[model samples]
Target: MKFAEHLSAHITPEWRKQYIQYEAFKDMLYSAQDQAPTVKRYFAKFEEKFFQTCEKELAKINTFYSEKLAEAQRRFATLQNELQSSLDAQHRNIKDLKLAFSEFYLSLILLQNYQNLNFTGFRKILKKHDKILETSRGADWRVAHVEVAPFYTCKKINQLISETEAVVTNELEDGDRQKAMKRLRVPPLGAAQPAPAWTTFRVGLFCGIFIVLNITLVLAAVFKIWPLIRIYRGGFLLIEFLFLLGINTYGWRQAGVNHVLIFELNPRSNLSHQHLFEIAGFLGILWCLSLLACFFAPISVIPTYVYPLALYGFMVFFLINPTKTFYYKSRFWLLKLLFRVFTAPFHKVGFADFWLADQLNSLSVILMDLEYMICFYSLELESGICHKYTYGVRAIVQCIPAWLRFIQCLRRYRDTKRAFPHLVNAGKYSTTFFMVTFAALYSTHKERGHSDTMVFFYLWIVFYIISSCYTLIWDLKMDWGLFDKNAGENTFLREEIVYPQKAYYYCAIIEDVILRFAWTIQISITSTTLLPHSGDIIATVFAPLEVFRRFVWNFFRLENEHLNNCGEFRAVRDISVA
Candidate 1:
């Protein structure tokens, strides 16, 4: 359809059959889409068909252009002789003679147009074929069959057009060379148009708003006492902004994430750390404004609910916007991957999908906070629900990341038919499942005036210990590919590491182990004596540390993934048409 539209618009109707049959070629490509396996087999069968058709298409163009050029030359000779004679014979009226020359010149232009059309047709079809087969034969085919062909190499058309233009300028147009040349010019396939003049104005207005909002937020924070929800909302956004600013983009590049490949992002268009920071700063500024102005406004000025609701609405709209502005391609990619992560096992698992799932797993606290916002802001603005109802919802929401990850491993197992990694990975997530489940259950009982030595509390402790140890081992051994039996020069780490210094590996392990057990502080507080607001204080203190742990985890996790990809000799995605 893409090429067909272009062909119909620009093609010479008289020589339509001589042009490449793009629709037929597309059909041929689609017919073989389900048949190929590996590169060798794909080429063995399809490459033969590919080149054979290509050669035949080349022959058709060469033959047609040869016939047209010879015919044009014949016509040119007759017209030149007539004009050279300078006869003012009544039978050969001056106007009629000049018209004949013009017709001959126009035919040359058509022939040249035909050349441009067919060459581009071949290029488009070849590009489509290469993409379908995931091969690099298109460019090679162009070099072999297109560049040397009669349609491309023929210079007779150019010479004829120029000669005709000169003759028209001297004889027909009475020496108005510019006028004659202007009339002879052909419109190209497309034209470059300047961007709208209002773009600068729009940018200036947006920046003005961005700056003003920041100043307003600063004044509000200084003048007013911050509410509990305000602190939580603001802190949540800060953590998210911090996560995007460096944890992945900057760190991934420093180590070898292969993030571009893992995410299947366009290397040319993908956002770098600077782009990430820009978005983070912009969102952070807007978030502060929304929180300060909408809720912190005097009660008579605006309703309190507007802050939570609109802030979310604005962000969701900004992200899911279909228009081509504001890095829409990257936003859409993340949205698509987010959808895939949410509906895991229903779709195939990719590293990008699970990597996001792991981040969500780390940000379980944030997800729980999201649930709380919905409960407080949407359900009842002025009057809030009891903590009892919210606790159950929090547990369910907290379990989602782990559940998505668990099923993702199951999906991988379904596809790989292997148990060693996928099954083991699923077990690791199951540990998280129980860890969150029992912890919530214990908290629920604690709220209802239950003792700390209860069964739920003990179960929470047991699962906490197991989950911490399980995940810690997985971090060092599986994710980071550390604790290698054949570490060689390195002590307990893997034989191959991207970073030159081996001490970082040892230090990273220590960091991971320390942060992995940070929740133990809460356990210690609860088991020892009743500390009011201990849970909140502990969570607030350690939430960022957990995120920090995941940040450090990303560098080693992706580096190891990159190394594994290297060992497997995979540079690009294994694209399969089938």
Candidate 2:
């Protein structure tokens, strides 16, 4: 039965008993029974409509919930990727920051070792900084802010620590608190404290000893004892050259250090330049004197003695002199002018002479071509000499003429001085003209007997020179200064004045000595290998001595210039004495 019908049946008995008691109740009961059937029917119809409406609504709700769940899952995956990327970026940033800190720390340690200052306190500072960095690892906000901000947080911490330490130390002198304060302030900015006095003393002593030994060797050579000890001296020279080469090459790989070296070689550092030139000049004078001695000295029993002495002197001068002299702003313009004047004669010589020279020059050029071919194609010469080295030599040699032309062109410009300032000017070109020519010669020698390869080599060399000349000429026409005057105004003092003033002259002097030494060695080797018969006793005895004399004169002149230029030393001395 329907729910309404069931309800009516239960009430029907009660209604009938009431109707029997009262005639009016009987009429009301009959009417109620008739209305019950109609109510029950209406209730059943409403229930059916309600269930249908619920089914439709429930289906729509299920679909919506399913779609929402899919969308949430997609969003979750995107968030996961973003988190992973952020973590990776954070790790990289931390690594870079650590590396930078390490570099600064190492520099401080080196300074400490050299200066003989208290290092214990410096170590404590490093420990604190490291601890702070470590603690900040998982601090996402801190890392993000630090990355965006420059010295804000770091400077704040440092300032706070400095103030606190100062106060504590002043209040509690000679106590544990004072000691702690001292430790806290030990490291100065990014620097460590100096090393112990004993350590510094030992190092200074060692350096002094080394200097003394070299001086002794120099004296011996100056005297006649060098003949007896020639072999030992030669061995020492070889060792010195190897040591210097290794140190220079290794130092070149470091950024800050290399930058310092570059700055030191700059011409604007006039005092430094003078100092370096003096050192080079001294070496040159020594070399010349020694060569003069070899040229004029009495026939020595040990003829080989002069050869080695001259070789040593020459190598020493070359190695010590500045290789970057070509970069000198004033000198470059002068040399360029000279080259232009010299080239005029070549052009005036007529097309025939020009062609002939070009053809002969082409031979050198061809060698370069062959060298390049060998390098790129891995083609081996009969002698098995690598083309790369030959090409390098040729390039060096060819640079000489090209550089001369470039310098001359530079001098003609009205604003040459403004365009090429003494501080940043590297002359007219990147490499020296002599260097290019040398490379060309070397390349030619590598393929000495390959006549068929000559044409291609000549073409390539000419092309290279033409291209290089074009670019250089174009650059000159543009007349752009090495540094932008407007943009670099603030940095000019640091980049052009201070660093270069301190460093370049010293480096130049060193390069000059080294270059001379190399040249002497090369001459000796060539004479010994190619013209063994030319090694007469008389020539051997006097050659090195004469060279030594010239070197000595040059050195003396350089020293005079250095003294004049470096007024700072005098100022310091005056202050100290007062």
Best prediction by lDDT: 1
- For model 1, how big is the CA root-mean-square deviation? 20.3
* Index of the highest-TM-score prediction: 1
lDDT of 2: 0.33
Error of 2 at 8 (Å): 99
Candidate 1: misplaced stretches above 4 Å? Answer: 1-247, 294-300, 377-385, 388-391, 447-453, 519-532
TM-score of each: 0.58, 0.25
lDDT of 2 by residue, 63-136 (tens): 43344334334433443354345446544543333232222222323222211211221222223323433432
How many clashes in each candidate? Answer: 0, 109
lDDT of each: 0.69, 0.33
Q: In model 2, which range of ten residues has the least summed lDDT?
A: 569-578
TM-score of 1: 0.58
